């Protein structure tokens, strides 16, 4: 009955293709061709945060929009104060193969993970005054590619075993495990209401998961290669993705399908990180060509380039208030733009 | 100017001083090596006396020193079959220790394809590769038995003759020497087809009981870094 099952699956796929086509009455490009262009967007490096002696692999801002954390291959997790470039903390890591880091919305905890297959939770407000390993979230069977904090007790970590898991920090157990991807999951973005999140993977499929029910709600396709970044739109009804095909694409949750392709013939370098502005009009992406390009989401027209990084850009983030954009790269420098 | 600002500044200065001290310590005269291979290849037995197993969560690290210079060798052996993503982390290594089971012809083409992918990878095109053709002892036994013919798995072996630059042991038979040098040349062809000139392959014939692997890695690292310095100084 395997053949019958496959035929049924094909029929279902055809039905889903025919439904979004009916939904696609028009295109955003012709819908917003009349709106005024944003013009040339120019950003200048305001503060350069030096002090890392190795390539920076990830970073994450804070809800206060002043403190940010960074992860590097030297084994140090450094919490910065971008306003005055003061290294508030410097957490030593047991393993130097970090691939991701996160900053809790409350600011009390900071997480990191990587090839060690373990998510390490670090307490930053302890009475002793020294950063201490809170919990080691073990149970994954693949490298941790991303992790984000829901609350001080729950964290969503994506791994390289084609799964995403939700952890209860106090007990150190997987409350809910999300499965369905056929490739390594490389990034995740949580929703503004923290009820849904997406996970770009190495199968060119971006899935939308329900945090409570632990089930995939929708699956998005369009990309032609490994997806390395994904970021929800401020509204929460859409997300963008960055892939190895040197193309960024915007997907809408309600319509169920792609609305925009942010690519150019010239571009032949994959995207390592994407992020949105405060209003979502600007979509900043980080490529392997050592440059970050700012795209106009509505019109898919390039607006500016954040050149100034000597090596490959590996991480990028925009503050919650939207005032500044931080770009990290392999040249051991984390630059703040405005 | 204020008390809080001064306290923050002095805390930052102390943090930076501690960071610089930790960077100077244990990171001078220390080289990282990425160890790659397959299940049949004896990747875990390359360094015998100073094999260090430090396994906790998927990566065991082997540390050894030859002449006051420390080498840290990392073997990632708990991920999935797919590896095109986790290998980009290992760009900084000075060399890649590639171990091949030359006795088994069936997986030899798979090993050659893996070597080809590693050699031409964008993030590993600068890293030199140290190649160990392990199980030379077994390879010799298989060739001498002759029950399995390497011509079936590689038709080019029929029109291959051992190089003049071959330096076989007196006990080695011409058939065994030709077979091992054919395997070495099969790897070196892949190496030199796309050798950018900034990374090189160093082929060594090794056996399980071999104890000079650390010295060979030491000399190969010497050559790699010397050539890197010469290239940086416009001398090569």
């Amino acid at each position, epitope marked *: 009955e395997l053949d019958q099952l*496959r035929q049924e699956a094909e029929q279902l*796929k055809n039905q889903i293709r025919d439904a979004r086509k009916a939904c696609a009455d028009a295109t955003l490009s012709q819908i917003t061709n009349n709106i005024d262009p944003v013009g040339r967007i120019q950003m200048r490096t305001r503060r350069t945060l030096r002090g890392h002696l190795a390539k920076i692999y990830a970073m994450h801002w804070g809800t206060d929009s002043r403190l940010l954390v960074s992860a590097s291959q030297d084994g140090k997790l450094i919490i910065w104060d971008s306003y005055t470039t003061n290294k508030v903390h410097a957490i030593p890591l047991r393993s130097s193969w970090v691939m991701t880091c996160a900053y809790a919305p409350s600011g009390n905890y900071v997480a990191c993970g990587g090839l060690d297959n373990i998510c390490s939770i670090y307490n930053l407000k302890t009475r002793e005054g020294n950063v201490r390993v809170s919990r080691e979230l073990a149970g994954h069977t693949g490298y941790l590619s991303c992790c984000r904090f829901l609350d001080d007790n729950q964290i969503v970590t994506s791994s390289g075993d*084609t799964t995403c898991a939700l952890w209860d920090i106090e007990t150190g157990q997987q409350t809910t495990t999300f499965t369905g991807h*056929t*490739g390594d999951v490389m990034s995740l973005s949580l929703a503004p209401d923290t009820r849904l999140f997406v996970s770009g993977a*190495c*199968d*060119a499929s971006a899935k939308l998961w329900d945090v409570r029910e632990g089930m995939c709600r929708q699956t998005f*396709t*369009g*990309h*032609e*290669s*490994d997806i390395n970044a994904i970021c929800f739109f401020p509204n929460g009804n859409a997300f963008a993705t960055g892939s*190895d*095909d*040197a193309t960024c694409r915007l997907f809408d949750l309600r319509a169920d399908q792609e609305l925009m392709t942010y690519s150019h013939d010239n571009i*032949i370098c*994959g995207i390592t990180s994407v992020s949105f502005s405060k209003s979502g009009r600007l979509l900043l992406a980080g490529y392997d060509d050592f440059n970050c390009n700012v795209w106009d989401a509505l019109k898919a027209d390039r607006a500016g380039v954040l050149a100034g990084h000597d090596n490959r850009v590996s991480c990028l983030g925009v503050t919650d208030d939207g005032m500044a954009v931080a770009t990290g790269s392999w040249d051991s420098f984390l630059k703040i733009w405005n | 100017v204020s008390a809080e600002d001064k306290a923050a500044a002095e805390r930052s200065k102390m943090i930076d001083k501690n960071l610089r001290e930790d960077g100077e310590k244990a990171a001078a005269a220390t080289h990282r090596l990425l160890l790659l291979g397959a299940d049949n290849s004896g990747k875990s037995t390359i360094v015998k006396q100073m094999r260090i197993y430090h396994v906790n969560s998927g990566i065991f690290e082997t540390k050894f020193q030859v002449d006051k210079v420390n080498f840290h060798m990392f073997d990632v052996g708990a991920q*999935r*079959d*797919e*590896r*095109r993503k986790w*290998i980009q982390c290992f760009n900084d290594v000075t060399a890649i220790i590639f171990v091949v089971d030359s006795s088994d012809y069936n997986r030899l*083409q*798979e090993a050659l*394809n893996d070597f*080809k*992918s*590693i*050699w*031409n*990878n*964008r993030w590993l095109r600068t890293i030199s590769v140290i190649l160990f053709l392990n199980k030379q002892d077994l390879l010799a036994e298989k060739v001498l038995a002759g029950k399995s013919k390497i011509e*079936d*798995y*590689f*038709p*080019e072996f029929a029109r291959y003759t051992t190089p003049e630059d071959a330096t076989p042991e007196p006990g080695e038979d011409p058939r065994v020497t030709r077979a091992k040098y054919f395997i070495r040349d099969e790897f070196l062809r892949i190496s030199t087809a*796309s050798g950018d000139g900034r990374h090189y392959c160093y082929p060594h014939f090794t056996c399980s009981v071999d104890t000079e692997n650390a010295r060979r890695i030491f000399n190969d690292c010497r050559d790699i870094i010397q050539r890197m310095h010469l290239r940086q100084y416009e001398l090569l």
Partner: nanobody
Amino acid sequence: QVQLQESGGGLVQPGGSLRLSCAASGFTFSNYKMNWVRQAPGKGLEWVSDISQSGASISYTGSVKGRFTISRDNAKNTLYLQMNSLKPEDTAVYYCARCPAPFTRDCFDVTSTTYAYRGQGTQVTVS
């Protein structure tokens, strides 16, 4: 969506010939390299052949060298594998698998157990 569907296959006597055509949709066929892999009964995936973007660079496994011919049709977005003078040792399920990233000379995980960009498979049996 990215999907690959092969063709050909069936029952053929030793020494026969078959045409294995793989149809590609949802991506640019010219940018990516293409590979052929097969799964013998009770064995793992074995790489069979390979072709570059322009089709100039072609490589074959030693077992099938001299008999199999690989051809790529960029205009029609299809890939072929001419299996001339095959033998009963060739009974396997053939998969067409592109390489993950475009404009690359390396193909890391084309033979991996769960490779995302493979095909469903074509059963080729020889008696």
